[PDB]
Amino acid sequence: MKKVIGSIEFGILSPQEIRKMSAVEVTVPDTYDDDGYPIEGGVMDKRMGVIDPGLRCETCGGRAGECPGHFGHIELARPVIHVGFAKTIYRILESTCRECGRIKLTDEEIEEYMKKIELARNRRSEFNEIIKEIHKKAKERMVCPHCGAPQYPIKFEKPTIYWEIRKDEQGNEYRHRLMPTEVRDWLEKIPDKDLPLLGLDPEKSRPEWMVLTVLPVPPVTARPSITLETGIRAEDDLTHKLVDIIRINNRLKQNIEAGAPQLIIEDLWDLLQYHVTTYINNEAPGVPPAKHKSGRPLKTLAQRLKGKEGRFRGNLSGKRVNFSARTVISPDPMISINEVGVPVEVAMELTVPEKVTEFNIERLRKMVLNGPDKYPGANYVIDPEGRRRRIMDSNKETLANQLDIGWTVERHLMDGDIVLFNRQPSLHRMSIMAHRVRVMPYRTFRLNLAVCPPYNADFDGDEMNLHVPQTEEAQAEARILMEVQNHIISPRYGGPIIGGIQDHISGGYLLTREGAYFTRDEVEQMLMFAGVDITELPEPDKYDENGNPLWSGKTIFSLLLPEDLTVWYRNKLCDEPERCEALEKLIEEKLMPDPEEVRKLAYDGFVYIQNGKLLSGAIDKKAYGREDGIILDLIVREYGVERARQFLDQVTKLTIWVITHKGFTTGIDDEDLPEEARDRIREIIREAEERVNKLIEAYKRGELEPLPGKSLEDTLESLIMAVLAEARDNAGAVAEKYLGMDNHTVIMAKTGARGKILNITQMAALLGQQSIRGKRLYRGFRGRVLSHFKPGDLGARAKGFVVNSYKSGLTPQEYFFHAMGGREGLVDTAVRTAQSGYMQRRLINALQDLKVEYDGTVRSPEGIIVQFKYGEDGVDPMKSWRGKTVDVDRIIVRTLLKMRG
């Protein structure tokens, strides 16, 4: 009943096939009569199809929307050369005898090269290399070895002109033009026994078919006509080109029939050849392209198949889909990571077909009664026959009574359905994942905040697309293969990609720092807010005045970890390494130290968890942050995805609550240095500027040994740049030193939550040297960047150095230098992406078809083995331990801890 396409073969259409498959011959160069009906015999004849409503195609009956169209043909007066096969005709002509049809080779060479063509035929490059040798060696021979006959060279001039050089005398030669009616007759005489030597195939590719004699006409449906509201008709370019071709052919035929001098037909022939050549391809080399009435060059058959809007990359590879939606996104941290908020307006438009069964008849019948305007409802019902019926206010109460097994109902979206969520550009495979629907009143998509990194999204105007699968197989595939919790680990480097971000780290540090303590109400409220299942508070840790019990942050945080976890490492907050060494020694000597001893030697730089109890350290980016998280990485590899999702949700909500009520802010006084720091910075800048004038004067009086790389000037520039960079670093050191951990910006920067030290030293100290493309500013007037400096100046401040901070303001020259430096980032971000995307396109188009077989080998589609074992050990990088095939020490330690306790 239903078949599938197994293979496709290519060839060249013979005139017999064109004349047989055609349904009508076109003679009249017109489309529509005065009334509006197609003109009989014109390029819009009814036999080739119908488009306008109210007309019937007499070839196959049908209507204006169900007729696929049928072909037509034109009988050319005289043959013309196909532009696509122009070069091949030249190669064939200059490598065969002029009057017998045989090839310019002997029998021994024919056998030798047939024995070579027999093998290595499935390949492309080798088969092309073989053909070139035959052409090269047969081009030189000037006499046919099969028949005694003289030969002459042939010159080819683009696009479709062939010249023959013949000797009028020994020293006098004249060039003769080969008209197509001679080339076809010459080509017709080549025997098929030597065609494979030329690279053709006798069954379905014959040389004499490259010279057209009859030209097919595409059907009406391949060139639709649009009726404008003004009453005038709009027609496709192909129609105009065909009309021109038909008119020229008719005039040439009439001139030939009526008799005329040779100079007339030999010019009409050239005009017709030009028209056909432009019709097939409008960008052929060395020919003025055809121009429309508006001056725009016409689009033709060749242009429809190439480019970013062609039939291949425009419609076949990617096409517009039906069930989709688009809107802005807004943050929502109160939903789990695998859910998405959907506006009630969209949820009432997109529909999910469902088949009524015995376990869901009641719900479906209830939904149908609500109609299409209340939220839980349906828009259409399908009877078993196949009719589609629209639910209306006068039909619901009777359609809900006819519902029975076998029917189909297009209901609305509910909580629990699964949809596809996408953000463009789709850079890697994690840009599309499946989420569970959750309906919201307002009109924006809601997204959890820990899911932002893989999407690379930010809430400043971004938009995202949503797709709804329709068939049960698609829903099952999305549910099993595309779940969010299944993509916590990134396949690029085998590390966590979904994790905490921004406040999720600052709140954790505020919760787990030294000296943090909480009252009873705060603890109960935070534990209830996070969602933890608890019915009894643990023992209090310390008593305030008036005997108020208090709990520490570590005790509260320990309630989220699994019971048998154990790990230790060092985080970014390590300042003095002589205090972590004692803890490492204590752990090493006795594998399970007494908790009191550990609590006595606690330090924020050393994280240590013992049997689910956090004994020392503080939360940081290395705890559960992206591409650095350790606890999350251990959890996802030892307990499952579900436990990781639960832990992620609970920890995020707890940290958000902690940061919300304790208070977190930054102000203008966060960059206020004492006077001595400013004095030290000023002295540093002064000495740095002073020790550059000495170098400048040294270069001015010779006395300077150049580095062997380049001339003296480049060495001077390099020395100056090194001095300035060292000066900036030295100045930033004291600014780092004089700002304590109490400052909120330092907290927010040293924990990896946001920013870095460079921002702090730029805000509280000098900006430093600006540069473009790695060299100092030199564009401007002759010898000086700006008009306010003396010509021929090489001073530090005269070529880009800025000695001011963002807080203290900038002088106009420094402002101009800063703008000059800052333009580079914008232009680089504008420029790089094009070539990056081109390289990614090439790479993805080269390595697409490589699978993994059941034997563990990677094979190309033809069957060639590329790798005898994927990678070199058959280990998936996504499932690897940070690149390593297996982490031995972790397994040893965990097993020893499990047994020796």
């Binding site: 599938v4 438009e349 971000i501 306010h788 303001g809 703008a819």
Partner: protein, 1101 residues
């Protein structure tokens, strides 16, 4: 002494007297006064094929702006009438024709040749010189600056192209060879010619000429212009002994091999290969005459001057080789000239007149040949008058101005005016664009330049690929017009300069150039430049003349052409500025103006050339004896929108760029006459406010009279997640009291068109019988005349105007319903209805819809310091925290967004705004002169608060104070026009493309999203094959095709007898069905359109 606060008074008068759109009005006035006459005089006259007839052109005049009704009468026109009725604001043109019979001139006659569009508020517009109340009575906003056209009811503006110098000589060097290429562009009557002379490894100089493919040698082309003797070449080029040796090395290729006519034979052989022998000489002479340096003339007599110029170019080329001249820089602003309206319009008028004259010639010749000489000579005036068709000019000018496609291949000359608010329009009227291609990187062109100081804004630029290639003029920038050159040349010749012909240049003598061409030599140019500039300061000559010198090459440059960009400065002599306190007083009282200050010699204009010799001091207390000029006001180097940011020197450059670009999108009261004004889209803010912290420039430029944005009470605090990642939280009660409320407008248009014959449209309530008749519910509030009643609620798909088209020929006797309806996803209330008549008698109606919009989730809010975001959550008032002094925040911003962007200016502005609100007086924040931070902190400490800006707040839920003091202040905020109500979109089923039967494109026509190729690659990478099948095929085009199994072609199914058979081969049993996408069937059909035959081999399963 003079303090920086005094120079501001002088700087104000510049804007108070000149304006902001001078570069358009001045250029258009110059074009009107002189361009038309020059263009007319270029042609001379008409030479028809009549034996004894010829016409000579006279004068040209421009009439009053008027419109002609179709019934015959002509009546005055006003801009608002043209805007409403979709007409064109133009004025007629008149020309005098002098008939010549047998060589004797007759009495002149005057005919109308067409109509010319009029720049608004120009020297010929009806609004010139009117008072404010006169403009009010005419419906115009007095704040409107003018300077744009009105084409077919739409407003067009001409941007300025940043072309290269028109006649200079630029040298360079490429690394792919050792070529020392010097190329020039030559302009004559709008024709651009590129000429290059260079050397290579052979050491022989070669020349490239348009239409001459081969690089003919230098001596060959020199001898074509005469001066064949070998002494003449060396005398023409130079006199340096090394140059003499190089030239002796060069001559041997042509010194004793060719003569003057032999080189002509060579050139004829090249330009006309294998043609007639006599043809070659004429072709070569023509090419030499009008393709080699056309700006020197096309007469054969100018060949000696052409040879001299070519020798000078070759001398520069060879001087580069010996390292006697550094290579020129293309990005230096002394080598670039701007194109204004007065030159583009000149080119367009030239081409249109060139068409018109040929049309007139053809008409006269045909009429005389047909009717006979007696009719022509019976009434010569009537014969001339009735042979002119005045449409070829008007239509060709109007279409070019409307579409924006200039003749010569240029695109984007004319653009639609941006009318979102005041700043957008004012900034759009001062654009500068580059003609380079956008896609290529162009690393050198996009970079900032030192010469841009004071001429181009360094921060206002687009963000996408257009970065760097589109720029905006600074505030001090002043464009220049052109003065006649013959007077300047004859003045320059009268103070010691000897002509070039009389004396040959030598290394001990200075050279003198005028507009790029060499005119003579002098023995001392250092005194000459001083004399010329002193004469300019005195007032003897015009101020558009700039003189500069280079002592390395001993050259003096004089410029008098238009297109240069200049800035004003204060003259400094003997270490003392020439501006005194009494001058400032006189300016303040009103006795003295800016033009008088220019005339008296206190202030002079400098272009990029004169600034080479200058040494400018920045502040009045930094001047010394070495300095030659004093900067007027450093804060004015910024553009117009980039000047809005308070304390712009405390921010990072990208944030300033973002703020400047984003300042052109905020909502606010744009223009006073928005009610009458008819626009496709519009916006209005209910309660606009003046910023508390502002720059003094905005008061001067008139921004305070049309503000946009309101002041919010902002607290920097981290809330419960809903304000993370650049999200903001807004109070609800503040919204309920009118904060950030706005209204949206939209206009619909309908026309009662006339068809061929008696067929016509009609305004009418459609009957139920007519085809396409919608539901009777939609025609709910239409009056019986077919128009909707104002102030009536309308929903989506409701009908505004009822129209019934004539029947469509196959349906007979059935009118078609083609009513205009509201967009399917909009909602509002009808505001006004206008009935009028078009320019050809047809009726016309315009309807506007008013919609109220309140802030909600997803709306975009943004300050002027580059911080943007969307509303994340709306909070009830009782849940927000409150300060212990009684203040409740109006907005919450995440503290995580501050450190990364390093926008300290926002904190400075918050402190300043709170201080200003407490003190009852606004705070000045004008760039480098505004109030310092420490003063504001001390004032805040004095007023009773804390100097750090922090306060104590109480939690809005628990009810107890937080552990940390919270920064809080007042910050100006703006509401952008990217609302969420215009972005929501969803599709289930709808219309499809005709050709490919795939879903349509666009939100406006119920289109669908595109599943691009990387989405397919992502789906492949996941491995979901069935998902790919569903998304790419099931939800898109899908069809069933009958395939013949025996031969592989597609079978044919007939509905007439339900029989299926293969047409090419007689097979009727092996026919099978295959399921495939329709696009692939179209691909197969297109492949079969060419001679390629694809054969299909089926398989089971």
């Amino acid at each position: 002494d003079v303090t920086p606060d005094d120079l501001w008074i002088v700087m104000e008068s510049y804007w108070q007297e000149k304006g902001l759109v001078r570069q358009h009005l001045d250029s258009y006035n110059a074009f009107i006064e002189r361009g038309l006459q020059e263009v007319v005089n270029e042609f001379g006259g008409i030479k028809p094929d009549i034996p004894d007839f010829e016409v000579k052109f006279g004068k040209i005049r421009v009439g009053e702006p008027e419109f002609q009704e179709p019934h015959g009468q002509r009546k005055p026109l006003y801009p608002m009438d043209a805007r409403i009725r979709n007409l064109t604001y133009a004025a007629p043109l008149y020309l005098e024709m002098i008939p010549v019979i047998k060589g004797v001139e007759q009495d002149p006659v005057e005919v109308r040749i067409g109509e010319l569009p009029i720049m608004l508020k120009s020297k010929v517009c009806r609004l010139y010189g009117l008072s404010d109340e006169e403009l009010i009575k005419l419906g115009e906003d007095p704040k409107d600056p003018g300077g744009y056209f009105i084409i077919n009811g739409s407003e067009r503006v001409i941007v300025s192209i940043e072309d290269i110098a028109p006649n200079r000589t630029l040298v360079e060097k490429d690394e792919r060879q050792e070529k020392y290429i010097a190329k020039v562009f030559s302009y004559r009557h709008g024709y651009r010619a590129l000429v290059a002379v260079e050397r290579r490894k052979d050491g022989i100089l070669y020349v490239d000429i348009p239409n001459v493919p081969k690089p003919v040698k230098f001596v060959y082309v020199m001898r074509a212009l005469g001066l064949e003797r070998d002494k003449d070449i060396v005398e023409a080029v130079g006199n340096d002994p090394e140059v003499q040796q190089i030239m002796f090395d060069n001559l041997e290729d042509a010194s004793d091999i060719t003569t003057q006519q032999e080189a002509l034979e060579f050139i004829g052989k090249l330009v006309a290969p294998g043609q007639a022998r006599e043809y070659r000489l004429k072709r070569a002479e023509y090419v030499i005459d009008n393709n080699l340096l056309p700006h020197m003339g096309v007469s054969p007599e100018d060949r000696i001057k052409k040879a001299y110029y070519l020798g000078m170019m070759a001398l520069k080329v060879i001087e580069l080789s010996l390292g006697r001249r550094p290579e020129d820089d293309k990005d230096h602003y002394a080598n670039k000239r701007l194109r204004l309206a007065g030159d583009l319009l000149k080119d367009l008028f030239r081409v249109a007149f060139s068409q018109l004259v040929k049309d007139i010639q053809y008409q006269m010749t045909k009429t005389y040949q047909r009717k006979g000489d007696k009719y022509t000579f019976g009434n010569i005036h009537r014969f001339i008058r009735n042979s002119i068709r005045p449409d070829v000019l008007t239509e060709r000018i109007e279409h070019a101005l409307a579409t924006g496609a200039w003749p010569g291949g240029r695109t984007g000359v004319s653009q639609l005016l941006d009318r979102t608010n005041y700043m957008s329009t004012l900034s759009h009227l001062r654009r500068v664009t580059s003609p380079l291609d956008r896609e290529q990187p162009h690393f050198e062109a996009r970079d900032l330049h030192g010469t841009h100081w004071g001429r181009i804004c360094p921060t206002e630029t687009p963000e996408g690929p257009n970065c760097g290639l589109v720029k905006n003029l600074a505030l001090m920038a002043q464009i220049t017009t052109a003065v006649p050159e013959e007077e300047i040349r004859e003045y320059l010749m009268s103070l010691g300069i000897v002509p070039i012909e009389v004396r040959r240049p030598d290394p001990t003598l200075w050279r003198v150039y005028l507009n790029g061409v060499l005119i003579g030599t002098i023995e001392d140019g250092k005194a000459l430049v001083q004399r010329i500039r002193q004469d300019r300061r005195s007032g003897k000559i015009s101020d558009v003349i700039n003189v500069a010198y280079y002592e390395d090459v001993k050259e003096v440059y004089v410029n008098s052409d238009d297109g240069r960009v200049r800035r004003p400065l204060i003259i400094v002599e003997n270490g003392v500025p020439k501006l005194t306190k009494e001058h400032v007083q006189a300016v303040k009282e009103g006795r003295l103006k800016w033009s008088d200050l220019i005339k008296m010699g206190i202030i002079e204009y400098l272009d990029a050339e004169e600034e080479e010799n200058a040494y400018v001091a920045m502040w009045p207390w930094e001047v010394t004896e070495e300095h030659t000029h004093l900067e007027l006001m450093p804060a004015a180097i910024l553009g117009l929108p980039a000047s809005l940011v308070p304390y712009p020197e405390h921010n990072a450059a990208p944030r300033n760029t973002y703020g400047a670009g984003m300042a052109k999108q905020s909502l606010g009261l744009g223009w006073a006459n928005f009610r009458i004004r008819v626009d496709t889209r519009g916006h209005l803010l209910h309660y606009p406010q003046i910023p508390l912290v502002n720059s003094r420039i905005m008061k001067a430029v008139g921004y305070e009279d049309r503000p946009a944005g309101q002041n919010f009470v902002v607290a920097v605090l981290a809330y419960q997640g809903y304000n993370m990642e650049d999200a903001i939280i807004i109070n609800k009660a503040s919204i309920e009291r009118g904060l950030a409320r706005s209204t949206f407008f939209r206009t619909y248009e309908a026309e009662e068109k006339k068809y061929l014959g008696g067929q016509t449209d009609k305004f009418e309530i459609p009957d139920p019988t007519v085809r396409g008749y919608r539901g009777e519910k939609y025609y709910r509030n239409l009056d019986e005349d077919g128009l909707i009643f104002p102030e009536s609620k309308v929903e989506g798909k409701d009908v505004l105007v009822g129209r019934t088209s004539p029947p469509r020929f196959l349906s007979l006797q059935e009118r078609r319903e083609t009513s205009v309806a509201v967009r399917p996803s909009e909602k509002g209330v009808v505001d006004k209805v206008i009935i009028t008549e078009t320019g050809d008698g047809t009726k016309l109606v315009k309807v506007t819809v008013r919609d109220l919009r309140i802030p909600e989730l997803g709306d975009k809010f943004a300050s002027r310091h580059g911080q943007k975001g969307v509303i994340g959550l709306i909070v009830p008032q009782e849940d927000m925290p409150w300060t212990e002094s009684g203040i409740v925040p109006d907005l919450i911003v995440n503290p995580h967004g501050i450190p990364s962007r390093m926008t300290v200016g926002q904190l400075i502005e918050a402190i300043g705004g709170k201080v200003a609100s407490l003190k009852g007086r606004r705070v000045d924040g004008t760039a480098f002169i505004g109030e310092p931070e420490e003063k504001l902190r001390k004032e805040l400490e004095e007023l009773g608060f804390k100097h750090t800006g922090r306060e104590i707040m109480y939690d809005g839920i628990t009810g107890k104070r937080l552990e940390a003091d919270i920064f809080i202040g007042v910050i100006y905020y703006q509401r952008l026009h990217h609302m969420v109500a215009d972005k929501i979109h969803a599709r289930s089923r709808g219309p499809v493309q005709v050709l490919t039967k795939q879903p349509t494109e666009g939100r406006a026509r119920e289109g669908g999203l595109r599943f691009g190729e990387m989405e397919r690659d992502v789906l492949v990478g996941h491995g979901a094959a069935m998902l790919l099948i569903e998304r790419l095929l099931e939800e898109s085009d899908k069809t069933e095709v009958w395939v013949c199994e025996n031969c592989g072609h597609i079978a044919l199914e007939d509905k007439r007898r339900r029989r299926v058979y293969c047409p090419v081969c007689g097979e009727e049993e092996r026919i099978s069905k295959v399921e495939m996408s329709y696009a692939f069937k179209l691909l197969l059909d297109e492949l079969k359109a060419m001679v390629i035959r694809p054969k299909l081999n089926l398989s089971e399963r």
